Amino acid sequence: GSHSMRYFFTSVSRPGRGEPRFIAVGYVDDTQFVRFDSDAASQRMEPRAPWIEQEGPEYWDGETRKVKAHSQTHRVDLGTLRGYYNQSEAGSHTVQRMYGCDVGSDWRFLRGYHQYAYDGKDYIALKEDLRSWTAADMAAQTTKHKWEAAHVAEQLRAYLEGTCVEWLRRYLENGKETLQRTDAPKTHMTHHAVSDHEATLRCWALSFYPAEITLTWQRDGEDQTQDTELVETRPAGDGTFQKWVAVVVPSGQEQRYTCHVQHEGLPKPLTLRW
Amino acid sequence: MGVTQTPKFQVLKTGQSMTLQCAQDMNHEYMSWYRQDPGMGLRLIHYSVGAGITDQGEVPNGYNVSRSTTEDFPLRLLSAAPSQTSVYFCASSPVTGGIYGYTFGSGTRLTVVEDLNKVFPPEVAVFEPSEAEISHTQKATLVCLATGFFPDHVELSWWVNGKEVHSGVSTDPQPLKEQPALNDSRYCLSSRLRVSATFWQNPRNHFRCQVQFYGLSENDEWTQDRAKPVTQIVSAEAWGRAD
Amino acid sequence: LNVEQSPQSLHVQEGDSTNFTCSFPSSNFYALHWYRWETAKSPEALFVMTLNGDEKKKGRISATLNTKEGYSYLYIKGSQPEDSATYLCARNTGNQFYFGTGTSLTVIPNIQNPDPAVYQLRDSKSSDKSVCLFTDFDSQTNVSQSKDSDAYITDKTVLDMRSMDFKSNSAVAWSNKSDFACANAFNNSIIPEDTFFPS
């Protein structure tokens, strides 16, 4: 399948308190490999996956330096945007940034992205071609004009196609044993008494990787998707994920519904009856 | 443009403090101070990425700054050491994290001397065209020579009949140590004014080079027998002649 | 962290063509800068180079960039006295830029039928310092001084304008004696053969 490297930025202002809070994290396909927090005791970019530790000399000088540089940009970004939207030094506000690239099964550059939100709502983002911008509003329009003359998208293309990928590939080679290792969804079912007339049936999927998965039921192939609750995927804490789908059923009529499951781990689209 | 930067020239007695003023009026976020010392070119002192944010540079020791506003970025020299002698520049650029080039301030020359005792005004002298240069190619050349000054803070102009001429003048770019050995040396500065052989032959003309020296201010203590080496102009004048 | 600039100093003839160089760690490159810095004035942004292989070029001046083996050349085509100055080179580290040593360049103007000659000029207080003067001083030497110990030399090449031709590369020497003696004040230098002495 495909592969990913994304970086996530969150800087939040704090009026009375001092400098705004800055958290940056780095991911490689559902695996965080580094982090920086402006309040961390170290004040350096830290390792989060045992395959980036085996590279601990001058790699952390630039990363620390460029992450501190990003933080610097975000500090100003909060004033600029406050001026744009005519806000005050009262409350706290939030900017976000996310960039990275995708590579295919061959590992030739597949996709590249870079987006930015203020206070949860989109603000400006880089299109698929990586040559132009999308303005959420008239303030984001000013940043589009500024950024165009600063030729920011050009510098983005170069990195997103050059360094961004060249290194994804590197990391993939470095940590093949876990990043390129896909686990299997160990699935099971349950059945609970909600009253004296109706039952449940919950369909599970545990200790798998990556987080992409699918589950449902069907009565006569005709998928039910009514009276359900497909909860969000949850991290186990060890690099694995979980998920479940549930349904409402008469304690008599039950054996007409199955349970579908999809995942890289094992080929055949495993199905389950109770 | 641009980046206004004050003052141009300055002498300081060791341990004395000072504020270097630089201001811009273009809404440039980024502002920074570099110093200049031969062999290493421009080394960064303190930089500023926006209003309220200040950050250290390559060589921040002994200087501090503030940036409470977009326009100004003052360089304060806590306590002048003789190694703080240098040339300073204040540079800015429109967007932080952007690629724009720095539009630089004017630049200031700073000398930190032990005792203000070391400061000397210059001695301007003019020199008549070679009465054989005229007889050779038909051109006249006047030479202005300022010597024995410290520190190297001067501006050399000329004046024909009373007008500041730039036509035909070639001053030196920078003052030179009288003998590069060594720091008891005063400084030197020269200029050739080449005009028509027959134009200097015309006795009605008043040639004059002048040199503004930037030195002491009625403000610093002056306890020596010689005149006070303040900031002042000094001129060697001359007249044409067909005699 | 380190921006090497080479050569440090070069004199070249008017109308000739150099092409100095600036190399840097290619690790984390993002952009590069070139500056013209006229002697005793503020540096001034020349080029802003970012992408690999791209070759910016303005006037009789140009520049290349190899971001992978970290280097950039600054070429000058038909060169001129005006193009004399220290040329600087900066790369990013922040949010920051780091200038290199800087490469100082002098362009010596050649002449309408050269007039190599040495003259002496007397002051206004009769006989003192009697400055020496060397017109059309040939720069095969031009290291710093010449026959110097208790002598002072400030020879430097300058320019315009025009009427009977003018591009000022003379030389000048003086002393504390007046017993000094011109047509003799330029020993450590290697002046031409046609040099002209009036006595």
Binding site: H70, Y116, V152 | - | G94
Partner: peptide
């Protein structure tokens, strides 16, 4: 590897 520079909005 991070982008070396992120320009302000």
């Amino acid at each position: 590897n991070l982008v070396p520079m992120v320009a302000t909005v």
